[PDB]
């Protein structure tokens, strides 16, 4: 990690080390695959988003919730 320019990074350089629940989030997206170190970014309802590993069980359990498919299409929001 040789980032010596301001503090505005683009790829994932730190994953929130906390078992945050999906209900405590609003949406999420994937970083650019062009980034050597890609990852998932979860956005909270406090305008705060961080990086997250796709290997976390809480991450896959939250994606199935924010996903537009969910499972059998139940409600909307």
Short mmCIF file of N, CA, C and O in Angstrom, two decimals:
data_model
loop_
_atom_site.label_atom_id
_atom_site.label_comp_id
_atom_site.label_asym_id
_atom_site.label_seq_id
_atom_site.Cartn_x
_atom_site.Cartn_y
_atom_site.Cartn_z
N UNK A 1 0.86 -1.22 0.00
CA UNK A 1 0.00 0.00 0.00
C UNK A 1 0.88 1.25 0.00
O UNK A 1 1.33 1.70 1.03
N UNK A 2 1.14 1.81 -1.15
CA UNK A 2 1.99 3.03 -1.22
C UNK A 2 1.14 4.23 -1.61
O UNK A 2 1.31 4.82 -2.66
N UNK A 3 0.21 4.60 -0.77
CA UNK A 3 -0.66 5.77 -1.10
C UNK A 3 -0.14 7.01 -0.38
O UNK A 3 -0.38 7.21 0.80
N UNK A 4 0.58 7.86 -1.07
CA UNK A 4 1.12 9.09 -0.42
C UNK A 4 0.53 10.32 -1.11
O UNK A 4 1.24 11.23 -1.49
N UNK A 5 -0.77 10.36 -1.26
CA UNK A 5 -1.41 11.54 -1.92
C UNK A 5 -2.76 11.81 -1.28
O UNK A 5 -3.71 11.06 -1.45
N UNK A 6 -2.88 12.87 -0.53
CA UNK A 6 -4.18 13.19 0.13
C UNK A 6 -4.68 11.96 0.88
O UNK A 6 -3.93 11.04 1.17
N UNK A 7 -5.95 11.92 1.20
CA UNK A 7 -6.49 10.74 1.93
C UNK A 7 -7.74 10.23 1.21
O UNK A 7 -8.52 9.48 1.75
N UNK A 8 -7.93 10.63 -0.02
CA UNK A 8 -9.13 10.16 -0.78
C UNK A 8 -8.76 8.92 -1.59
O UNK A 8 -8.33 9.01 -2.73
N UNK A 9 -8.94 7.75 -1.03
CA UNK A 9 -8.60 6.51 -1.77
C UNK A 9 -9.80 6.10 -2.64
O UNK A 9 -10.86 6.68 -2.56
N UNK A 10 -9.63 5.11 -3.46
CA UNK A 10 -10.75 4.67 -4.34
C UNK A 10 -11.01 3.17 -4.12
O UNK A 10 -12.14 2.72 -4.14
N UNK A 11 -9.98 2.40 -3.92
CA UNK A 11 -10.17 0.94 -3.70
C UNK A 11 -10.41 0.68 -2.21
O UNK A 11 -10.54 1.59 -1.42
N UNK A 12 -10.47 -0.57 -1.82
CA UNK A 12 -10.70 -0.89 -0.39
C UNK A 12 -9.36 -1.01 0.33
O UNK A 12 -8.57 -1.90 0.05
N UNK A 13 -9.09 -0.14 1.26
CA UNK A 13 -7.79 -0.20 1.99
C UNK A 13 -8.06 -0.47 3.48
O UNK A 13 -7.17 -0.43 4.30
N UNK A 14 -9.29 -0.75 3.83
CA UNK A 14 -9.61 -1.02 5.26
C UNK A 14 -11.04 -1.55 5.36
O UNK A 14 -11.97 -0.95 4.86
N UNK A 15 -11.23 -2.66 6.02
CA UNK A 15 -12.60 -3.22 6.15
C UNK A 15 -13.11 -2.99 7.58
O UNK A 15 -12.42 -3.25 8.54
N UNK A 16 -14.32 -2.51 7.72
CA UNK A 16 -14.87 -2.26 9.08
C UNK A 16 -14.85 -3.57 9.89
O UNK A 16 -15.60 -4.48 9.60
N UNK A 17 -13.99 -3.62 10.88
CA UNK A 17 -13.86 -4.81 11.74
C UNK A 17 -14.99 -4.85 12.78
O UNK A 17 -14.76 -4.69 13.96
N UNK A 18 -16.20 -5.05 12.35
CA UNK A 18 -17.33 -5.10 13.31
C UNK A 18 -18.49 -5.91 12.70
O UNK A 18 -18.77 -5.81 11.53
N UNK A 19 -19.15 -6.71 13.50
CA UNK A 19 -20.28 -7.52 12.97
C UNK A 19 -21.54 -6.65 12.89
O UNK A 19 -22.47 -6.83 13.64
N UNK A 20 -21.56 -5.71 11.99
CA UNK A 20 -22.76 -4.83 11.86
C UNK A 20 -23.89 -5.61 11.19
O UNK A 20 -23.66 -6.37 10.27
N UNK A 21 -25.09 -5.40 11.67
CA UNK A 21 -26.29 -6.07 11.14
C UNK A 21 -26.75 -5.40 9.84
O UNK A 21 -26.45 -4.25 9.59
N UNK A 22 -27.47 -6.11 9.02
CA UNK A 22 -27.95 -5.51 7.74
C UNK A 22 -29.00 -4.43 8.05
O UNK A 22 -29.08 -3.42 7.38
N UNK A 23 -29.81 -4.65 9.05
CA UNK A 23 -30.85 -3.64 9.40
C UNK A 23 -30.18 -2.30 9.72
O UNK A 23 -30.80 -1.26 9.68
N UNK A 24 -28.92 -2.33 10.06
CA UNK A 24 -28.21 -1.06 10.39
C UNK A 24 -27.59 -0.48 9.12
O UNK A 24 -26.73 0.38 9.17
N UNK A 25 -28.01 -0.94 7.97
CA UNK A 25 -27.44 -0.41 6.70
C UNK A 25 -28.58 0.01 5.77
O UNK A 25 -29.74 -0.29 6.01
N UNK A 26 -28.27 0.69 4.70
CA UNK A 26 -29.34 1.12 3.75
C UNK A 26 -29.08 0.51 2.38
O UNK A 26 -29.97 0.00 1.73
N UNK A 27 -27.86 0.56 1.91
CA UNK A 27 -27.54 -0.01 0.58
C UNK A 27 -26.06 -0.38 0.51
O UNK A 27 -25.34 -0.25 1.48
N UNK A 28 -25.60 -0.82 -0.62
CA UNK A 28 -24.16 -1.20 -0.75
C UNK A 28 -23.82 -1.41 -2.23
O UNK A 28 -24.69 -1.52 -3.07
N UNK A 29 -22.56 -1.47 -2.55
CA UNK A 29 -22.17 -1.68 -3.98
C UNK A 29 -20.77 -2.31 -4.03
O UNK A 29 -20.13 -2.52 -3.02
N UNK A 30 -20.30 -2.62 -5.21
CA UNK A 30 -18.95 -3.24 -5.33
C UNK A 30 -17.96 -2.20 -5.87
O UNK A 30 -18.32 -1.34 -6.65
N UNK A 31 -16.73 -2.27 -5.46
CA UNK A 31 -15.72 -1.29 -5.95
C UNK A 31 -15.36 -1.61 -7.40
O UNK A 31 -15.83 -2.58 -7.97
N UNK A 32 -14.54 -0.80 -8.02
CA UNK A 32 -14.16 -1.06 -9.43
C UNK A 32 -13.25 -2.30 -9.50
O UNK A 32 -12.30 -2.42 -8.75
N UNK A 33 -13.54 -3.21 -10.39
CA UNK A 33 -12.70 -4.43 -10.50
C UNK A 33 -11.29 -4.04 -10.94
O UNK A 33 -10.35 -4.80 -10.81
N UNK A 34 -11.13 -2.85 -11.46
CA UNK A 34 -9.78 -2.41 -11.91
C UNK A 34 -8.88 -2.20 -10.69
O UNK A 34 -7.67 -2.23 -10.78
N UNK A 35 -9.46 -2.00 -9.54
CA UNK A 35 -8.64 -1.79 -8.31
C UNK A 35 -7.93 -3.09 -7.95
O UNK A 35 -8.55 -4.13 -7.82
N UNK A 36 -6.64 -3.04 -7.78
CA UNK A 36 -5.89 -4.28 -7.42
C UNK A 36 -6.57 -4.97 -6.24
O UNK A 36 -6.70 -6.18 -6.20
N UNK A 37 -7.02 -4.21 -5.27
CA UNK A 37 -7.69 -4.82 -4.10
C UNK A 37 -9.15 -4.35 -4.04
O UNK A 37 -9.45 -3.35 -3.42
N UNK A 38 -10.01 -5.09 -4.69
CA UNK A 38 -11.45 -4.78 -4.74
C UNK A 38 -12.13 -5.20 -3.43
O UNK A 38 -11.52 -5.80 -2.57
N UNK A 39 -13.39 -4.90 -3.29
CA UNK A 39 -14.12 -5.28 -2.05
C UNK A 39 -15.55 -4.75 -2.12
O UNK A 39 -15.95 -4.12 -3.07
N UNK A 40 -16.33 -5.02 -1.11
CA UNK A 40 -17.74 -4.53 -1.11
C UNK A 40 -17.87 -3.32 -0.18
O UNK A 40 -17.29 -3.29 0.89
N UNK A 41 -18.62 -2.33 -0.57
CA UNK A 41 -18.78 -1.13 0.30
C UNK A 41 -20.23 -1.04 0.77
O UNK A 41 -21.15 -0.92 -0.02
N UNK A 42 -20.45 -1.09 2.06
CA UNK A 42 -21.85 -1.00 2.58
C UNK A 42 -22.14 0.44 3.00
O UNK A 42 -21.35 1.08 3.66
N UNK A 43 -23.28 0.95 2.63
CA UNK A 43 -23.63 2.35 3.00
C UNK A 43 -24.66 2.34 4.13
O UNK A 43 -25.67 1.65 4.06
N UNK A 44 -24.43 3.08 5.17
CA UNK A 44 -25.39 3.11 6.31
C UNK A 44 -26.37 4.27 6.11
O UNK A 44 -26.22 5.08 5.22
N UNK A 45 -27.38 4.35 6.93
CA UNK A 45 -28.37 5.46 6.78
C UNK A 45 -27.78 6.75 7.34
O UNK A 45 -28.42 7.79 7.36
N UNK A 46 -26.55 6.71 7.80
CA UNK A 46 -25.92 7.94 8.36
C UNK A 46 -24.95 8.51 7.32
O UNK A 46 -23.98 9.16 7.66
N UNK A 47 -25.20 8.27 6.07
CA UNK A 47 -24.30 8.80 5.01
C UNK A 47 -22.88 8.30 5.26
O UNK A 47 -21.91 8.92 4.84
N UNK A 48 -22.73 7.19 5.93
CA UNK A 48 -21.37 6.65 6.20
C UNK A 48 -21.24 5.26 5.59
O UNK A 48 -22.04 4.38 5.85
N UNK A 49 -20.25 5.04 4.77
CA UNK A 49 -20.08 3.70 4.14
C UNK A 49 -18.63 3.23 4.32
O UNK A 49 -17.72 4.03 4.41
N UNK A 50 -18.42 1.95 4.39
CA UNK A 50 -17.04 1.42 4.57
C UNK A 50 -16.85 0.18 3.69
O UNK A 50 -17.76 -0.26 3.02
N UNK A 51 -15.67 -0.38 3.70
CA UNK A 51 -15.43 -1.60 2.87
C UNK A 51 -15.79 -2.85 3.67
O UNK A 51 -15.80 -2.83 4.89
N UNK A 52 -16.07 -3.93 3.00
CA UNK A 52 -16.43 -5.18 3.73
C UNK A 52 -15.99 -6.40 2.91
O UNK A 52 -16.10 -6.41 1.70
N UNK A 53 -15.51 -7.42 3.55
CA UNK A 53 -15.06 -8.63 2.81
C UNK A 53 -16.29 -9.47 2.43
O UNK A 53 -17.20 -9.62 3.21
N UNK A 54 -16.27 -10.00 1.23
CA UNK A 54 -17.37 -10.83 0.72
C UNK A 54 -17.32 -12.23 1.35
O UNK A 54 -18.12 -13.09 1.04
N UNK A 55 -16.39 -12.46 2.23
CA UNK A 55 -16.29 -13.79 2.88
C UNK A 55 -16.96 -13.73 4.26
O UNK A 55 -17.07 -14.73 4.94
N UNK A 56 -17.41 -12.58 4.66
CA UNK A 56 -18.08 -12.46 5.99
C UNK A 56 -19.50 -13.00 5.89
O UNK A 56 -20.25 -12.66 4.99
N UNK A 57 -19.89 -13.84 6.81
CA UNK A 57 -21.27 -14.40 6.78
C UNK A 57 -22.29 -13.27 6.91
O UNK A 57 -23.36 -13.30 6.33
N UNK A 58 -21.97 -12.26 7.68
CA UNK A 58 -22.92 -11.13 7.85
C UNK A 58 -23.03 -10.34 6.54
O UNK A 58 -24.02 -9.70 6.27
N UNK A 59 -22.01 -10.39 5.72
CA UNK A 59 -22.05 -9.66 4.43
C UNK A 59 -23.00 -10.37 3.47
O UNK A 59 -23.83 -9.76 2.82
N UNK A 60 -22.88 -11.67 3.36
CA UNK A 60 -23.77 -12.43 2.44
C UNK A 60 -25.21 -12.40 2.98
O UNK A 60 -26.16 -12.41 2.23
N UNK A 61 -25.36 -12.36 4.27
CA UNK A 61 -26.73 -12.34 4.86
C UNK A 61 -27.36 -10.96 4.64
O UNK A 61 -28.56 -10.82 4.55
N UNK A 62 -26.55 -9.94 4.55
CA UNK A 62 -27.10 -8.57 4.34
C UNK A 62 -27.38 -8.35 2.85
O UNK A 62 -28.37 -7.76 2.47
N UNK A 63 -26.52 -8.83 2.00
CA UNK A 63 -26.73 -8.66 0.53
C UNK A 63 -28.08 -9.26 0.14
O UNK A 63 -28.85 -8.67 -0.59
N UNK A 64 -28.38 -10.44 0.61
CA UNK A 64 -29.68 -11.08 0.27
C UNK A 64 -30.83 -10.20 0.76
O UNK A 64 -31.97 -10.39 0.37
N UNK A 65 -30.55 -9.25 1.60
CA UNK A 65 -31.63 -8.37 2.12
C UNK A 65 -31.72 -7.11 1.25
O UNK A 65 -32.78 -6.74 0.79
N UNK A 66 -30.61 -6.46 1.01
CA UNK A 66 -30.63 -5.23 0.17
C UNK A 66 -30.81 -5.62 -1.30
O UNK A 66 -31.24 -4.83 -2.11
N UNK A 67 -30.48 -6.84 -1.64
CA UNK A 67 -30.63 -7.28 -3.06
C UNK A 67 -32.05 -6.97 -3.54
O UNK A 67 -32.99 -6.97 -2.77
N UNK A 68 -32.21 -6.72 -4.81
CA UNK A 68 -33.57 -6.42 -5.34
C UNK A 68 -34.36 -7.72 -5.50
O UNK A 68 -35.56 -7.71 -5.65
N UNK A 69 -33.69 -8.84 -5.46
CA UNK A 69 -34.40 -10.14 -5.61
C UNK A 69 -34.85 -10.63 -4.23
O UNK A 69 -35.98 -11.04 -4.05
N UNK A 70 -33.98 -10.60 -3.26
CA UNK A 70 -34.35 -11.06 -1.90
C UNK A 70 -34.61 -12.57 -1.93
O UNK A 70 -33.87 -13.35 -1.35
N UNK A 71 -35.64 -13.00 -2.60
CA UNK A 71 -35.94 -14.46 -2.66
C UNK A 71 -37.27 -14.67 -3.40
O UNK A 71 -37.29 -15.11 -4.53
N UNK A 72 -38.36 -14.38 -2.76
CA UNK A 72 -39.69 -14.57 -3.42
C UNK A 72 -40.37 -13.21 -3.61
O UNK A 72 -41.58 -13.11 -3.64
N UNK A 73 -39.60 -12.16 -3.72
CA UNK A 73 -40.20 -10.81 -3.90
C UNK A 73 -41.22 -10.56 -2.79
O UNK A 73 -42.39 -10.89 -2.93
N UNK A 74 -40.80 -9.98 -1.70
CA UNK A 74 -41.75 -9.71 -0.59
C UNK A 74 -41.72 -8.22 -0.24
O UNK A 74 -40.72 -7.70 0.22
N UNK A 75 -42.80 -7.53 -0.46
CA UNK A 75 -42.83 -6.07 -0.14
C UNK A 75 -41.86 -5.33 -1.06
O UNK A 75 -41.49 -5.82 -2.11
N UNK A 76 -41.45 -4.15 -0.69
CA UNK A 76 -40.51 -3.38 -1.54
C UNK A 76 -39.55 -2.58 -0.66
O UNK A 76 -38.35 -2.62 -0.83
N UNK A 77 -40.07 -1.86 0.30
CA UNK A 77 -39.18 -1.07 1.20
C UNK A 77 -40.03 -0.38 2.27
O UNK A 77 -39.58 0.63 2.80
#
